[PDB]
Design a protein around this ligand. Structure first.
Ligand SMILES: Nc1ncnc2c1ncn2[C@@H]1O[C@H](COP(=O)(O)OP(=O)(O)NP(=O)(O)O)[C@@H](O)[C@H]1O
Ligand SMILES: Nc1ncnc2c1ncn2[C@@H]1O[C@H](COP(=O)(O)OP(=O)(O)NP(=O)(O)O)[C@@H](O)[C@H]1O
Ligand SMILES: [Mg+2]
Ligand SMILES: [Mg+2]
Lengths: 431, 375, 349, 348
């Protein structure tokens, strides 16, 4: 578009020169296109839109080569300079303001069945690749091209599928879950309302899988936020414009006192996002959360919602020896062929809900026991009328160094579950 | 109005050119309308008002196609560009300043009997819809049209009234309370003095009900504010521009350090902050809704604090029963369902919140738990 | 004054045009009045004053309709537009600066016997209403007019005096204290250095009655704890009284004591220079029980006031019964007619 | 000085007009004095100084009627407007900048023997009052006038010396100590390295005495602090330009540093920390022994106890409400304190 804009600017300048000649020599000869005329030409030839009608919203420009609308003022000013090189920053701002006044308002395309990919948009319902068009309004895209794959690409005799199987310790459910996680991570408009947690201790490859995800997806498309960082100031501003968020290492057993923002982001629940000294606003984030940590951190709420939102992935394979191959995380996962094959395999995979592995269910139950002492008691206690005896301070806090209640909130245990009444029956080794 | 403003701009430019030609060549072809003349033209042909006379009060413009006065600067700038394309940001700001000096002051119409919706104004005293007029001063309207509903819409065998009953666990008192809650949610110029708290756990539909409320009200017309985040810097800055505020989630048994601001908000007692605008004091009549598990305790416990809150039970579990996702991301987004909900709720007459028996039992339980003295 | 300023501006523009004509066609036609000339005309034909010569003090203009000096730059700029509509914001700031340079310095009147009302100024020494004059300097006034009445207006058979006694547990001393509280509250330009506090019910309805007898715009909502922080005191300009609801069972004693007294305070505006200003608005705060009093000083108990609130308290009272114009006029008349010099001590507390 | 500047105005303007006339109709009648010329005229006909060469040091103007130098920008702007009304805020700022470039640098007279009051400068070395001159550099003065006196003024037949003795339980030693305390309090350039503590059980006239001591000094010359918050940050900021600090009740290293003349680290909000020396005297009143947790030699030596006990805890409400506000009693007590001279406080 540089050639077209250069030619347009040259012809407009020649026309202005001819008009000045025919009108006579009055003042200095005009040589700079007026900002209003420049904006008219840009609107006529290029494609400029406005995402909304709110206060001082930024004009968006469609990059024909990129295929995605951008709000970056630097690119727009470079295009303006292509049309008119003599305009300084103020004149470029004036041109942008005129374009904002002129162009029409179209909302962002937020269809969950459309996924922007470097080659072009991907229609999940049709399972096809459609070429880029200005009709689809996108602000970001996956940095990996979509090409048809038939044979697994092997680099230095190393197979991505075999590596995935190795990471899962040869478990079909876990590899299926991992492929599903990749597919969910690529989609930025569908959430599935589940929180992905990579739980594993020592060398396991959690970071390698996270780097693979950050490589197949755009690196700039990945946010970095640990679960405990959600609830403080300015942190949600990172989530804006990101397809997924990855927590590299959550501290072991961190106390998540506040989980409202985390729960909102996990689901499609709207939340108040605030930028640093910018007008805060309400927005909805559909990006999936993926966290890697050694052991499962415990939450203050320890209720049904945090249980149903959480998903745990096993990383039991250990490479803390000669088995460790640095090139897997340094070079192999950066291979373009491997990334393209991974993207193809993940995007072609289709499903509606995550397939929970049996091991994940076991660890989910273990986390439920650990975080909630009541359920740990209920599991450990494997009669009915005696409430004081079965209470016994949670039978001495079921030997987990927990804190008990005043035997009033303990009966919330029958919420997890003592069918109702004797009149004579109502530390200790002892049921 | 774009065509009208273009016609007036062309006519004014032609008149100025003729005056310059008859005067000679001293003016060197004046082609831009002066900002004061632009302000005069806009005031004469459009409807610009000033809500009230204080420091840095923003001009309001009546959108003829929308029927609501807006203080959005960008819209006014676009209108000015319609009148005069060649004005930059500074000249358009000059036009806005001249209009602010020129226009008269009118206060926003805050009558609990008038409710604006996409179709027009709705009057409860007479119970009918009226076309938009500049006389009615409104800053935000509900994004759902008001139409006459004869039959309850059903999609894929899913009925909105049946869904409400399922959420409410088949009790007439609680469904009446939900309908009254919705009716209060549309009306942002009146308060019922009782906070709304969707208390539940797991797949209880409180999030689905909140999403339904947001959809019927309109996404842009509702803002999300926390119960704990009621009093802090640069917060509550966009709350005034929305008809209602809902808390998506609240921590279980969360301690409240500043509930006086919360009490002022729920009761209607009177302070906004902005990046480049001085603090302004106003009352809050928008309804307050919070979704949570249990009833969080408050350090300002008293008769008034307890009576100012209302507990809405959500005792339905949708995990054992196979949940329909299309209920939450597809069904409640349908225009017909939203229109029926708006019609049914706005036609309902409001006097006070009809307290269900289950709500009374949960209120008594919370009273016993928060204050052991009574128990 | 809009017609006067319009006529003056038209006359000045015509005179400038004639002066340019007699000098011949030299440059472009002068069509806008220079800001210095506008400032001269405004100073001659209007009343502009300066409260004090402090750093970056703001010009005050006498509103003839209201009778009170105001520092609102928007109203002043509207007056500028009346005189000269072609001046943008910068030229209006320039003319305001010139006026600030020219105008005389006068101190705000703080006579206890003079209290501004929407109808006029009430003098307690003669107990009489007088028309507005620029000679008296006021910054705020009551928005309920003062009228002469001899009866107690009754709406739906409701008596204000009996209701006040019901709230006050039916004691003469406490109801007299309540009337004195009203009298102190409506005085926005004079202060007794007493910080009114509400301890309790019926407190909310009485607070709303106070907020209604005074103009709502004249009321500023602030708590004691929030006086100190930056960019919070600027809302106290031109306010007759400041009423707040401090947390129940929660009290510094910095600038709160300063605003309670007539002492100047360094008030600040966003993106505007700071300046020293004096606020004499009556301070009212509501809470259940005694304030915390972290300071625990005798002078604090000396300055503040405690008003007991004990009752068995009905949505009707809230609307149209305390917002009635007749009720507000009656309570204003009764409170302003009461004459006192020292505060009373109720027998119920 | 408005008349002088007005006379200077439209006289340089006439000179510019006639220069333009003799040069021909080419300047379009320049009727506005250039900012540099305004600075020249102001420097020639007024007294503008600069306190120090610090960054962004504000120009100071000598108010002839007031007798003290001021950095108030508004007054300087008014003076410039008197010279030439047709100046923007930017043009007047340019005039101020040119003056700042022109004027000489002078240091404020911080002599402990010189005390400024509304009538003039009092020198303790000569024990004499001198008229206001631009040679002396003062940024503040005591608002109570100083005149020669021969009798004790009385309001409603009430004495000041009798009242002070009644507060001081009628003992000559403690009365002399109170007079010395006032003398040290008014002097803002000398400390005596003693912290005066008022120990009592109730009012005893200590509150009204502190109110009187605040009244005799300027309104803005007094600071309010308690012991507990000397260690807390940003609390030193209130001592930027004060002459003394007085508390009311007491419900340690920084406090000890403030008591003596050794420098302390003052921190301003959104401003780098800097060390400064405070010569203001500290006076604290409280009920009983003030709280302390660093009992040692330095604290004991630095503290001075002035017990207060009487029946005032008659409540002396008439004395506090209006009697101390009378100008006669204020000038009397100021004169009595200024005449009194001593070297150090006397232990009761
Ligand atoms: N299948 C594999 N076989 C051998 N080495 C592997 C394999 N997968 C990953 N690695 C290597 O093992 C290391 C994994 O490091 P990384 O993934 O950052 O941390 P982690 O194992 O998740 N946790 P930690 O050990 O605490 O740092 C890197 O050197 C990888 O290249
Ligand atoms: N009547 C219904 N029948 C079937 N599914 C339903 C029904 N009502 C709601 N659901 C589904 O149940 C889920 C409830 O929505 P959700 O927002 O997760 O609830 P919630 O009560 O906010 N959960 P939580 O935050 O854990 O307390 C959604 O998937 C709904 O589509
Ligand atoms: Mg790692
Ligand atoms: Mg929810």
């Amino acid at each position: 578009v540089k050639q077209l804009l250069n030619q347009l600017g040259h012809e407009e300048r020649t026309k202005m020169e001819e008009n000045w000649i025919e009108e006579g020599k009055r003042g200095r000869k005009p040589t700079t296109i007026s900002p209003i005329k420049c904006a008219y030409i840009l609107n006529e030839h290029l494609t400029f839109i406005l995402f909304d009608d709110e206060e001082n919203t930024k004009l968006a420009m469609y990059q024909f080569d990129e295929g995605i609308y951008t709000q970056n003022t630097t690119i727009i000013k470079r295009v303006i300079s292509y049309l008119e090189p003599k305009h300084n920053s103020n004149k470029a701002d004036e041109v942008i303001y005129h374009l904002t006044n002129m162009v029409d308002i179209k909302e962002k395309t937020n269809s969950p069945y459309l996924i922007p990919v470097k080659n072009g948009v991907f229609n999940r319902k049709t399972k096809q690749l459609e070429s880029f068009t200005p009709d689809y309004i996108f602000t970001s895209k996956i940095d990996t091209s979509y090409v048809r794959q038939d044979i697994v690409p092997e680099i230095n005799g190393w197979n991505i599928d075999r590596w995935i199987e190795e990471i899962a310790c040869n478990d079909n459910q876990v590899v299926k879950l991992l492929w599903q996680v990749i597919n969910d991570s690529m989609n930025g408009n569908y959430t599935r309302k589940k929180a992905i947690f990579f739980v594993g201790d020592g060398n396991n490859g959690k970071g390698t899988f996270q780097e693979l995800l950050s490589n197949v997806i755009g690196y700039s498309n990945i946010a970095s936020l640990k679960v405990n960082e959600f609830d403080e100031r300015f942190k949600l501003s990172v989530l804006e414009g990101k397809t997924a968020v990855i927590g590299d290492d959550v501290p072991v057993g961190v106390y998540v006192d506040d989980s409202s923002n985390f729960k909102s982001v996990v689901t499609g629940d709207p939340v108040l996002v605030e930028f640093k000294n910018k007008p805060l606003y309400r927005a909805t984030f559909k990006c999936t959360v993926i966290q890697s940590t050694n052991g499962m951190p415990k939450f203050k709420d320890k209720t049904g919602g945090t249980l149903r939102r959480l998903l745990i992935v096993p990383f039991n394979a250990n490479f803390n020896g000669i088995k460790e191959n640095f090139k897997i995380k340094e070079d192999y996962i950066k291979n373009q062929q491997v990334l393209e094959y991974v993207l193809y395999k993940a995007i072609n995979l289709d499903f509606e809900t995550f397939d929970i592995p049996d091991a994940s269910k076991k660890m989910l139950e273990v986390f439920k026991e650990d975080n909630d002492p009541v359920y740990g008691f209920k599991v450990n206690m494997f009669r009915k009328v005696p409430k004081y005896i079965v209470y016994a301070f949670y039978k001495e806090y079921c030997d987990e160094n927990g804190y008990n209640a005043l035997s009033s909130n303990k009966f919330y245990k029958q919420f997890e579950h003592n069918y109702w009444t004797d009149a004579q029956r109502r530390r200790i080794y002892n049921n």
